[PDB]
Amino acid sequence: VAKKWVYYFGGGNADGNKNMKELLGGKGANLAEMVNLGIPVPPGFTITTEACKTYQETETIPQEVADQVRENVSRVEKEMGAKFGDPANPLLFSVRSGAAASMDTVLNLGLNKVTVDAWVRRAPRLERFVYDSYRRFITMYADIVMQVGREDFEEALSRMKERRGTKFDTDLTASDLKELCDGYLELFELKTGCSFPQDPVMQLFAAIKAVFRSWGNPRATIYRRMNNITGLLGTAVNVQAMVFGNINDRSATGVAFSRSPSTGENFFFGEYLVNAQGEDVVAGIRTPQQINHSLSLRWAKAHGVGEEERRKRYPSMEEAMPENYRLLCDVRKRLENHYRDMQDLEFTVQDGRLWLLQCRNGKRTIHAAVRIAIDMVNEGLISREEAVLRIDPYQVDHLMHPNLEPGAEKANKPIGRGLAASPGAAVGQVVFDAESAKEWSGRGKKVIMVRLETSPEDLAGMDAACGILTARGGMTSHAAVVARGMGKCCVSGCGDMVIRGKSFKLNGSVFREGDYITIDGSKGLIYAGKLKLRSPDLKGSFQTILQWCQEMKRLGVRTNADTPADAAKARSFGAEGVGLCRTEHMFFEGSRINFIREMILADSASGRKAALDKLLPIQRADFVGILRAMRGLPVTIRLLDPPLHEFVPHDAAAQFELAQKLGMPAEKVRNRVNALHELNPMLGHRGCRLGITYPEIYNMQVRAIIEAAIAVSEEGSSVIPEIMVPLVGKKEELSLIREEVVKTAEAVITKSGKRVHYTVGTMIEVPRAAVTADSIAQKADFFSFGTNDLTQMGCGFSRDDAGPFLRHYGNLGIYAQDPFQSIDQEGIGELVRIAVTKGRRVKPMLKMGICGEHGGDPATIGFCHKVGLDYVSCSPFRVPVAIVAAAHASIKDRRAAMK
Amino acid sequence: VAKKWVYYFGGGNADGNKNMKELLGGKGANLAEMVNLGIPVPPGFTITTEACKTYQETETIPQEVADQVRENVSRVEKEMGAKFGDPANPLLFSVRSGAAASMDTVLNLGLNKVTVDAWVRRAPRLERFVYDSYRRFITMYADIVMQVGREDFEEALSRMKERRGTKFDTDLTASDLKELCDGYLELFELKTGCSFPQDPVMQLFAAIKAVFRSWGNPRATIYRRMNNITGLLGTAVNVQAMVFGNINDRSATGVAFSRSPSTGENFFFGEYLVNAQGEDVVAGIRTPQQINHSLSLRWAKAHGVGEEERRKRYPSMEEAMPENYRLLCDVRKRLENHYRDMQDLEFTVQDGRLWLLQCRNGKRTIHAAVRIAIDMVNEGLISREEAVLRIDPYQVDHLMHPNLEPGAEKANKPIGRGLAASPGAAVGQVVFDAESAKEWSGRGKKVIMVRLETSPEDLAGMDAACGILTARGGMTSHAAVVARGMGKCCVSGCGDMVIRGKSFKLNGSVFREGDYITIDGSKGLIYAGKLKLRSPDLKGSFQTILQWCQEMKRLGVRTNADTPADAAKARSFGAEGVGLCRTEHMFFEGSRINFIREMILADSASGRKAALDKLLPIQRADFVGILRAMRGLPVTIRLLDPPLHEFVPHDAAAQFELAQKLGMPAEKVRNRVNALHELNPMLGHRGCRLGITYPEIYNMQVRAIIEAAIAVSEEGSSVIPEIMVPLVGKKEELSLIREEVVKTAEAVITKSGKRVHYTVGTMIEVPRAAVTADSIAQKADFFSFGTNDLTQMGCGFSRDDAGPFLRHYGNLGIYAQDPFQSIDQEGIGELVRIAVTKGRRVKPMLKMGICGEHGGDPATIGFCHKVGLDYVSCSPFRVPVAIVAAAHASIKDRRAAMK
């Protein structure tokens, strides 16, 4: 001999190991890893990628690959005890493809007539099941391994469902299925020339050859284009013994989570069923049993159940099968210790003997991920660094979900109980199918969805509805799973609920599209619809994660905020200053609007100057109001941005009459109004443009600042203002405005006899500024990137007008995503790239930042990190997300540069 | 000895030569060059830059620089005959600075009391003149060489003008001036401590030291910053003997042009005066005499003069001073042969002896430059290449000036005659001072300006007025000169005109702000105001220059034109195709507007499709109309650009009623009208955006083309259309539209069974396209640069709105010039630079062009050449200018790469 084409696994030893993902594919390496690890995985063997390649380039399987496969089957037989192809003690295989990177899966390989009507006449509780599986398998076979369609078995099935009068397979009987199978057998012996392979070994090779075929598959040769991992070899094949927990009453299957995927709490959560095929566990019919004792005790304590009932009706793996729960408990510890993470587990006790069928890093809610992470830090399982990475910024918003307040005893009203399937609380009128809820969302109405059980076709309406409430289902209930997949508060398995039409009766009371509420506490109610923001968020829980994020973050996180109310909110998530405080608002709402309306009119520059010293203190006051919020912290303020025509009506009478002297009615109104009107206001007279034709403004503004600025300084604190000039396009556009502010500022400083440190700098929002960024650097003290504006000019999109088509672009996939939400990295970013480099060539230590909506978007933030920006600025309620996303980018980099 | 600090010139030999511009400055090198050349320049010497430097770094003049200056004065004395400082035969100097690169000039150095009241008592015809010069000189001295102001001599002068009752120096007499001088003498001996230097030699050194001082001058240290020729040494000094043509009646001064600065014709044009100081020649009082015989004969033949009159009253240098005209004729030939160009000459016959005081490449009108250039090619003086370079593209517009038609005998009416001072003809109401004309321009009124004589304070109104007509002045008349400086048609020296108030009487008839006309034929009229475009321009004259330009040009010159009327006009200046034919117009004016109005409404896509096949042939027809113009030539067509909201009213009733069926009044008008309204229409739904939401349009358009396109092909010709897609921003924005046209095109081709070669390509007008130009290349066949649009987005300027401030920017000098007229090379250009390189990286042989207004602007064109574009496209009436400007850039480059 020489070559080795096949790799056994199971004996606790396993030929291969966790390193050969090249030969055994990831599934196969993983399996190997697992058994060497010592966990009880049903046996089988792996067929190396080389084997696969040898098949593509010639439609053959080498004789020594055959021999070799036979060599191992006889090993699997030995290990399990059964015998492949022997109707007395049969052994069945599952055949699956090796490579997580995406070709399908076959159960019950090894089924044939003899083995069937000898298994039935041998344990006839399961006569229904056997035929179910045979017809299932016969179909799987012809479809996949023979490529002969299904539209035919599908038809002859339903043709048999109408003959008995249901719509469900669930009602077909042993006798029906047998009929089904028997027709399938000849329907097969027709659609193709031959009869269904009774020889389980031919069946086997057929399987193998069909997996190797599923690789060159056209539906798959594409795969390697736009997944682009070229040069792979082929795919492994994983043959594996089948096991069952519906054999007898010392058999079970179940599903379990090393830690709660909702609370996150450290207990052994699970569900099982004696003599049951998992399916039944999910199904929800027939109440699922808790694996752990404590946990049963409390499910019971939170329903009408007393001990002597649960004891004999709904036990607990811990006491029903204690031997094994003890061991399943070991395995739980074992794998958590290995993978360093919450696992979820599928298992099966076939005849007293425990098997672990499937094991994955477990999905979880955001709350849960936050907990487990902290715990495993403490427990010593992972680093704080590692912790942080297991928290998704996209999900950090889910912590901003409302739950109830003690207004749950303000009045009671729990007219029902279920599972605490998904954290949260939700109000809403109800609706009874995917399409019901698909609709009321759109009328402005928030909706609770109620279905007996949900499914992947109740799905569209699922992420529409504000809440979900099902009649049946465990913690593994479909609704349950998917709800946590979106952190959409859910209560499931409430079997008291009787559903009929668009109504349902919750013990006592009856309901229809009225207003309900549900909770993660798991109780159905009828409003108490005073939710609350969990704004004192996660009680130093999340806050700890943020601390850590603060420690590995490189980028500073500042806030976009112009109310001190908005300043201090954002600061108290640990924002470190403002990257954008816009001064328009202290010209608009309230008393202010009028006196600007006076200035723009004043047919005289010495005139307006008076219309100005009017507004000195109304603003100056709004500025202490802001500077007071950020004591010790930097604040960037964008001087008046827009055109004067937004401060004026069209017709109003009330304005011209506050008035000055005569020679003046309501068409020196219409003069400068249709006089100040523009075609494309966006690119009209504003920003610096405006502040150079009429300068004294930027001066009032500038003292309004430095007046307020020096004031606060006195009061035992320190303050640094960053004067920003909008819309600058050319080096000299800015150079003038500069001494135009350094005038006002240096005057207030001289007159006041007391010093304060300001800096003048510009928005980079015009494309030209980007390109000429080097020269613009000489007059500047920092850059804020106005990527919003800069995207509109960069792309030629007047945001408010791109409705008709942008949405459309998203579909056919021009821009992967609204570039006003996440930066166009290919283009708009290049502009930024260009700016950052040229600018730093000149001033190498130039402060650079970004602001607006992109400021809070992770992907963008990550880009900003790479590109070299100094800080990011975002709205208050993103501060958290950003802080994470930042530390998140910094973390990835620190590791990359370590290899 | 060793060093040589001073360089004599004059003896026909001249120490230095034309190469030492480093020591002798350009004036000094030039002088040297001149005399070695053999032309009679009044003698003098040059004081090397080294001398200058030695003075800055110590306020001294080396003893050997003194000695040396004395050495040469005694050489000048020898040469001329006079004696410096000897009141019997005095010699006077002019002292001027050496370096054309910009410090001033002093005449009559060497004047002192003795020399004066001995010159007077020695030839007292000139007693007036001597004192004039002395007071002049005394002032020049104190101002410049003593830096003591003038506000004082100026005052004491005018204080003496009021005492005699005029406003003019012209009236002050010998006796007055003597008084003036005598007070100046003590006014000097006061303003400073000492009396006026009688010692002409001290006077000399003083001169020298003051020139060296005028170099370190603050008003001059600036000079070297923003002229930036750092490291110069200093400045030379040019001392030179003074000469006079007012000595006797065998003395003259004059001014002459080796070829006519108006017609360009090859004759000796000039003007002189016997016993006259040039000044008198310009002045216009006392009729100027022609230098050449022929030329006198014809001036006379074109006024009331007979031979026996001119013979004794207004002779001719040719026959008055024949000896010398013969020689001045030689010199003319000599210098033209040397400088290879039309010269103009200032001269002076002092006592029978000819001197040439000044000689420069002569300014000329565009017509003239075109002639002389051609002639000197033929004559063998210069190459065709060189020719081309002596033609300014900025002036090529001046050939587009109107002159009369034979409608000058349609009716006569020449109620006057003057000089043909400046080519052209002009209609207009008249006005009588700079401010008169400064005004009527602005009322839409075109104005003729009439002044006895003009001057540098009649100047603002000068370039306002459509024409100029003066009462006095030769070909050297101020008005004359400056008129040719702008090619503004002018008639001067019409002494028949008597001016009074805002009236004047032209022999017979009297006039006031009525409507006149003037001509380069030199006759005043009263309309015949049917001018004509000299559109059959320059009779193969200019056309020859264009041929040549065509032969050295690199860039192709295409035209921006969408009427076949506009196509063939531009082609017949030799434009080589269209770079922009915009298809909006065949949706608007006339029948078409209605049926588009139908499409935009058709609430149904299959609906509009019918509203389309409507417009197939109205356009298809407009396309043969265009394709017929450019047979053999390329035509680029920009598919529909704009938004639908420009094809709709606001209120109209007439539209909804052409109508379809019921359920439809005048607020399914207002729906889609305020529904299709945008905030910034510029960046709204259009170009490709529009052609992807509604595609069938770009299809109608595309067949409308290729239908018309194949048609023309049949008719014995060949045609190539270049389908251009507006507004493309992303690689895939275009990629779709592409097969979206290749569909329609490949269909029409298949259905027609006959082939035609199209190309699809895009406008580069969005900044993002520029930056991502590499990827956009893969789907394109050419680039047209939409630098208009691209400047608006690039700069953030909505052109129609930039009124309020752009004009202002121009003043303080942000942008040197409206960037919508000439490309912002620093920024918008960089974008282009970026585009061109990235694009060519991908497709190296990509066709690239530019269009719009920048297309015709030289400076921009020159940029386009450097940057590597393939063609330029401009409006018909720029084609010429562009062709020149192109060949002009290509020419410069060919020479640069040869060294």
Short mmCIF file of N, CA, C and O in Angstrom, two decimals, chain B residues 263-311:
data_model
loop_
_atom_site.label_atom_id
_atom_site.label_comp_id
_atom_site.label_asym_id
_atom_site.label_seq_id
_atom_site.Cartn_x
_atom_site.Cartn_y
_atom_site.Cartn_z
N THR B 263 -3.14 98.42 -41.84
CA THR B 263 -3.31 97.55 -43.00
C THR B 263 -2.31 96.43 -42.92
O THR B 263 -2.62 95.27 -43.24
N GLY B 264 -1.09 96.77 -42.51
CA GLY B 264 0.00 95.82 -42.50
C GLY B 264 0.85 95.93 -43.76
O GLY B 264 1.90 95.28 -43.88
N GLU B 265 0.40 96.77 -44.69
CA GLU B 265 1.01 96.80 -46.00
C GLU B 265 2.46 97.20 -45.90
O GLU B 265 2.85 97.94 -44.99
N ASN B 266 3.27 96.69 -46.83
CA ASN B 266 4.72 96.91 -46.79
C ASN B 266 5.19 98.24 -47.40
O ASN B 266 5.70 98.28 -48.52
N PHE B 267 5.02 99.33 -46.66
CA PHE B 267 5.52 100.64 -47.07
C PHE B 267 6.14 101.33 -45.86
O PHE B 267 5.93 100.89 -44.73
N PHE B 268 6.89 102.39 -46.08
CA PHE B 268 7.49 103.08 -44.94
C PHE B 268 6.55 104.17 -44.36
O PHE B 268 6.57 105.33 -44.79
N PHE B 269 5.73 103.78 -43.38
CA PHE B 269 4.83 104.73 -42.74
C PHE B 269 5.50 105.53 -41.61
O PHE B 269 6.24 104.98 -40.80
N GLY B 270 5.24 106.83 -41.56
CA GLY B 270 5.85 107.68 -40.56
C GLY B 270 5.27 109.08 -40.48
O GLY B 270 4.39 109.45 -41.26
N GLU B 271 5.75 109.86 -39.51
CA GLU B 271 5.35 111.26 -39.34
C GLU B 271 6.50 112.06 -38.75
O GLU B 271 7.18 111.61 -37.83
N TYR B 272 6.72 113.25 -39.28
CA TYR B 272 7.77 114.09 -38.73
C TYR B 272 7.45 115.58 -38.78
O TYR B 272 6.43 116.02 -39.34
N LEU B 273 8.35 116.35 -38.18
CA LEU B 273 8.19 117.79 -38.09
C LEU B 273 9.55 118.44 -38.12
O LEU B 273 10.44 118.06 -37.36
N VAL B 274 9.71 119.45 -38.98
CA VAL B 274 10.98 120.15 -38.98
C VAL B 274 11.04 121.14 -37.81
O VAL B 274 10.00 121.70 -37.42
N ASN B 275 12.24 121.31 -37.25
CA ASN B 275 12.42 122.14 -36.07
C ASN B 275 11.22 121.91 -35.12
O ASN B 275 10.33 122.78 -34.95
N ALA B 276 11.19 120.73 -34.53
CA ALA B 276 10.10 120.37 -33.63
C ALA B 276 10.55 119.34 -32.63
O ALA B 276 11.30 118.43 -32.96
N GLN B 277 10.08 119.48 -31.40
CA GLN B 277 10.30 118.43 -30.44
C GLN B 277 9.18 117.40 -30.60
O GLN B 277 8.00 117.75 -30.57
N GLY B 278 9.55 116.15 -30.85
CA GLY B 278 8.57 115.08 -30.92
C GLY B 278 7.83 115.19 -29.62
O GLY B 278 8.46 115.36 -28.57
N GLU B 279 6.50 115.11 -29.70
CA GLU B 279 5.59 115.65 -28.69
C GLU B 279 4.67 116.47 -29.53
O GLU B 279 3.45 116.36 -29.45
N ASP B 280 5.30 117.31 -30.34
CA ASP B 280 4.63 118.12 -31.32
C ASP B 280 4.09 117.22 -32.41
O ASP B 280 3.04 117.50 -32.99
N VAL B 281 4.81 116.14 -32.67
CA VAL B 281 4.39 115.16 -33.66
C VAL B 281 3.11 114.46 -33.21
O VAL B 281 2.13 114.33 -33.96
N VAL B 282 3.14 114.00 -31.97
CA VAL B 282 1.98 113.36 -31.39
C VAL B 282 0.88 114.39 -31.23
O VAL B 282 -0.25 114.19 -31.68
N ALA B 283 1.24 115.51 -30.59
CA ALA B 283 0.30 116.55 -30.21
C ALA B 283 -0.86 116.73 -31.20
O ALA B 283 -2.02 116.81 -30.79
N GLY B 284 -0.56 116.79 -32.49
CA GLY B 284 -1.60 116.94 -33.48
C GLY B 284 -1.79 118.37 -33.96
O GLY B 284 -2.19 118.58 -35.11
N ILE B 285 -1.54 119.36 -33.10
CA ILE B 285 -1.51 120.75 -33.56
C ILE B 285 -0.45 120.80 -34.63
O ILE B 285 0.62 120.20 -34.49
N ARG B 286 -0.74 121.55 -35.69
CA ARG B 286 0.15 121.62 -36.83
C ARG B 286 0.35 120.26 -37.51
O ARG B 286 1.09 119.39 -37.03
N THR B 287 -0.36 120.11 -38.62
CA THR B 287 -0.36 118.91 -39.44
C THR B 287 0.99 118.21 -39.58
O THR B 287 1.96 118.81 -40.05
N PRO B 288 1.03 116.92 -39.20
CA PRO B 288 2.19 116.03 -39.31
C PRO B 288 2.51 115.70 -40.77
O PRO B 288 1.59 115.44 -41.57
N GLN B 289 3.79 115.70 -41.11
CA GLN B 289 4.18 115.33 -42.47
C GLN B 289 4.56 113.86 -42.60
O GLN B 289 5.19 113.27 -41.72
N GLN B 290 4.16 113.28 -43.73
CA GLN B 290 4.50 111.92 -44.08
C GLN B 290 6.00 111.81 -44.38
O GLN B 290 6.59 112.73 -44.94
N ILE B 291 6.63 110.70 -43.99
CA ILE B 291 8.06 110.55 -44.26
C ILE B 291 8.28 110.20 -45.72
O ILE B 291 9.12 110.79 -46.39
N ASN B 292 7.50 109.25 -46.21
CA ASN B 292 7.62 108.76 -47.58
C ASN B 292 6.90 109.62 -48.61
O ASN B 292 5.79 110.09 -48.38
N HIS B 293 7.53 109.79 -49.77
CA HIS B 293 6.95 110.53 -50.88
C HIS B 293 5.58 109.98 -51.36
O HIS B 293 4.56 110.68 -51.23
N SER B 294 5.56 108.77 -51.91
CA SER B 294 4.30 108.13 -52.32
C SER B 294 3.20 108.43 -51.31
O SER B 294 2.11 108.88 -51.67
N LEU B 295 3.50 108.16 -50.04
CA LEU B 295 2.52 108.27 -48.96
C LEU B 295 1.98 109.67 -48.76
O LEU B 295 0.79 109.84 -48.49
N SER B 296 2.83 110.67 -48.89
CA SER B 296 2.36 112.05 -48.87
C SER B 296 1.42 112.26 -50.04
O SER B 296 0.29 112.71 -49.87
N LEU B 297 1.89 111.91 -51.23
CA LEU B 297 1.09 112.07 -52.45
C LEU B 297 -0.33 111.58 -52.28
O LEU B 297 -1.25 112.16 -52.86
N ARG B 298 -0.51 110.53 -51.48
CA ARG B 298 -1.83 109.93 -51.36
C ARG B 298 -2.65 110.49 -50.20
O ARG B 298 -3.87 110.48 -50.26
N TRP B 299 -1.98 110.97 -49.15
CA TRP B 299 -2.67 111.64 -48.05
C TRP B 299 -3.29 112.88 -48.65
O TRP B 299 -4.42 113.27 -48.32
N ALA B 300 -2.52 113.48 -49.56
CA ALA B 300 -2.89 114.73 -50.22
C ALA B 300 -4.03 114.45 -51.19
O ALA B 300 -5.02 115.18 -51.23
N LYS B 301 -3.89 113.37 -51.96
CA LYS B 301 -4.92 112.96 -52.90
C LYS B 301 -6.21 112.57 -52.18
O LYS B 301 -7.26 112.45 -52.80
N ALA B 302 -6.12 112.38 -50.87
CA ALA B 302 -7.28 112.04 -50.08
C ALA B 302 -7.58 113.14 -49.08
O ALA B 302 -8.12 112.89 -48.01
N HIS B 303 -7.18 114.35 -49.43
CA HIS B 303 -7.72 115.57 -48.83
C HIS B 303 -7.74 116.58 -49.96
O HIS B 303 -7.46 116.24 -51.10
N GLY B 304 -8.08 117.82 -49.65
CA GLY B 304 -8.29 118.80 -50.69
C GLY B 304 -7.03 119.32 -51.38
O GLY B 304 -7.11 120.28 -52.15
N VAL B 305 -5.88 118.69 -51.11
CA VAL B 305 -4.59 119.28 -51.49
C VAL B 305 -4.09 118.97 -52.90
O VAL B 305 -4.24 117.84 -53.39
N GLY B 306 -3.51 119.98 -53.53
CA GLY B 306 -2.87 119.82 -54.83
C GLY B 306 -1.37 119.78 -54.64
O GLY B 306 -0.86 120.14 -53.59
N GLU B 307 -0.66 119.34 -55.67
CA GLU B 307 0.78 119.10 -55.53
C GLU B 307 1.59 120.32 -55.10
O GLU B 307 2.44 120.24 -54.19
N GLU B 308 1.35 121.45 -55.76
CA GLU B 308 2.16 122.63 -55.53
C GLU B 308 1.94 123.14 -54.12
O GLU B 308 2.69 123.96 -53.62
N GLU B 309 0.90 122.64 -53.47
CA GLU B 309 0.71 123.00 -52.08
C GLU B 309 1.59 122.12 -51.19
O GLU B 309 2.50 122.62 -50.52
N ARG B 310 1.33 120.81 -51.19
CA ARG B 310 2.10 119.90 -50.34
C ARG B 310 3.58 120.12 -50.56
O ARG B 310 4.35 120.11 -49.62
N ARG B 311 3.97 120.35 -51.82
CA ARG B 311 5.37 120.55 -52.14
C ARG B 311 6.05 121.57 -51.20
O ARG B 311 7.16 121.33 -50.73
#
